[PDB]
Amino acid sequence: TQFEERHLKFLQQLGKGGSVEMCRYDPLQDNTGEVVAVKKLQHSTEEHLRDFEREIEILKSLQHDNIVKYKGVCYSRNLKLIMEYLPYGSLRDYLQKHKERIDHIKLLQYTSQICKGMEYLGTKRYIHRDLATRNILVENENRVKIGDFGLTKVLPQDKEYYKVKEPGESPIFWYAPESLTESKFSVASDVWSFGVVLYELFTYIEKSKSPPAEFMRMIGNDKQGQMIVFHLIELLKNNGRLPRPDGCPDEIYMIMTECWNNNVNQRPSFRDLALRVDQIRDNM
Template identity: 55%
Template sequence: MEYVPLGSLREFLPKHPLSLSHLLLFAQQICEGMAYLHSLHYIHRDLAARNVLLENEHVVKIGDFGLAKAVPEGHDYYRVREDGDSPVFWYAPECLKECKFYYASDVWSFGVTLYELLTRCEPGSSPPAKFLEMIGATQGQMTVLRLIELLERGRRLPVPGDCPCEIYRLMKNCWEAEASFRPAFPNLIPILKNFQEKYRSQAPSVFSLC
């Protein structure tokens, strides 16, 4: 495995304050990596900040393909049949309810990863912490059932503290309940590139926050 000296985004971001433009550059690179993976007919199934590694302060790479699966020829999803722990707080409703993983399921997970970026991976704002605040104390399969109920009511992760509205809207597009309504990674790349260039030239004080 390639050595990446700076570790994962989850380890790096809480210790190294980065600008919004810098975070969006990472988000763009993640989308480029995922677009390539999907072009090879693979679904990652575990996209999260903990699995995005920094080669240096300006380049990130997607890692941990332990849950990755090839999509069978003639199908547009992979159905999980084995038991095992899953990163449920990064999963789309179809993954939780039907054990079906579409290419669009990775897009949902990207939306959660983008949320992690915008919260700088602060532990108190992590997806598990925020979802458990909403569903209450629970464990085991009951956690999944309550999470499904929450998502079916249209509840989503909250807007990060200094997140521009247009970026939060992009996250919510990634969290559309219907998989076919979510954007594909090739479509997300130019959007994030435009955001990255826009916010590179703006001071934080002029951002239109939600």
Template identity: 35%
Template sequence: MGETEDGLHRVIEVLSETDLSGYLSRIRDDLQVTKLSHFEYVQANDLERIGLSKPAIRRLLATIKQKQRSSNTKKQLSNTTSLPSSSSSSSNSCLISPSSLNLSVTLGSGHFGIVRQGEWDGLPVAVKILRGCNAISDFVREANAMHLLSHRYLIRLHGIVLSEPLMMVTELAPLGSLLSRLRSEPKHFLVYMLVEYARQISEGMDYLEQRRFVHRDLAARNIFLVSYEQIKIGDFGLARMIDTDCNLYKPGTVIGQSIPIAW
């Protein structure tokens, strides 16, 4: 952490959150701790020596670990995404302040976490909320992919929230997924509507191909209805860039072969 990110103010903040502010002088003077990163060299018996109980020590160290994990995550996202602040209008997506979001009902869930409906400065949005830290790389990859894409038949990324937990704010498709609508209202969808959806999906996928992306998870559950006349492709967590040198998509060592774009 840099000096501006990790200083005595961070230590004071953690002690306040854990109701241990009274130990500040002993932690600072006796243990010579003036940054959160200094706790890496502090043992539990050091904290016991200055008067902290075992439950207080566990509470303090757990909070420090959470703060450091959050800081590392933000640094990772900052290094891998180039989103402007929400005050900038030079890009399609931006960093969003959590205070500007109002969350409401849960729309769905998956291995990554949950999706909730919400409002961002009065605009209806869908908010993907990351569960834990196991999916951070997928979160970063999806944010990067969506940040580079803009098409009328693709779900738009409004921005990401560097909070705990991490959140991704996207365009809301009010009618939900095509799969759920087909199951709940099968008689509503006439053949000409399905043909039109197929045309729109093809146009969206053609745009992805032009931008050298492979979606890898195109399915009815990831097609969303903005209205009964228009769909949008979403869920870019598995999207990958195509190798520009050999014009091939390489799925990895599990399959162990290259698949031509012409698939």
């Protein structure tokens, strides 16, 4: 079923990736249409549009409780991706709003769900490359979803990693060492990122304890540009890690540090992590 240009009514800006907007699809003109989320490119050029195209094929092929629902495409050659509107917004902002009102068993509900979405994403040999709580969204109290795939890559047939030859924006404070030195991206480096996401959850996304704040302190605030990359590689090669979050129980911190293993072979699988997290939840 089609989405006509003329019947997308702008409601609100939501954020920058493209840009993401809240719209009413109102083909009946009485404002009874569904509210949806629209992703559109900001500088649609032949290279970047092919990317957005590949990304849409990625999302459309993904069907899971914890991945945002693809709804359709809007044409005029210029693309608007139409997605379900998840009413509780960005997980990053939701955790900040309901600070400590969210207890440990609830944060583990969220952990488990993120984890399952990643495990499933692995069965199609996709690599997120951008797992971070500002790419997680909230549907309701009981339900979060991976909400963006702008940087996802597909594994090549014969390799278990992907080389990104000329990187664009790079969320380096979420990056595994091998990604930093070599641009090698794999399920295992998504696991590293998941560990950092677990860190984010348990700090309640308090900005003074965020990963960029914390690594910068460790390497010195006087580090700038490419020097940050150099020193972060060194720091991590020597087991410099994010601290245990304040109030974070032993066994959840344990999980993070297994994710942050320098040896890629020895990081856990998303399959084990989902079992592990659910075991803990039931124990509590």
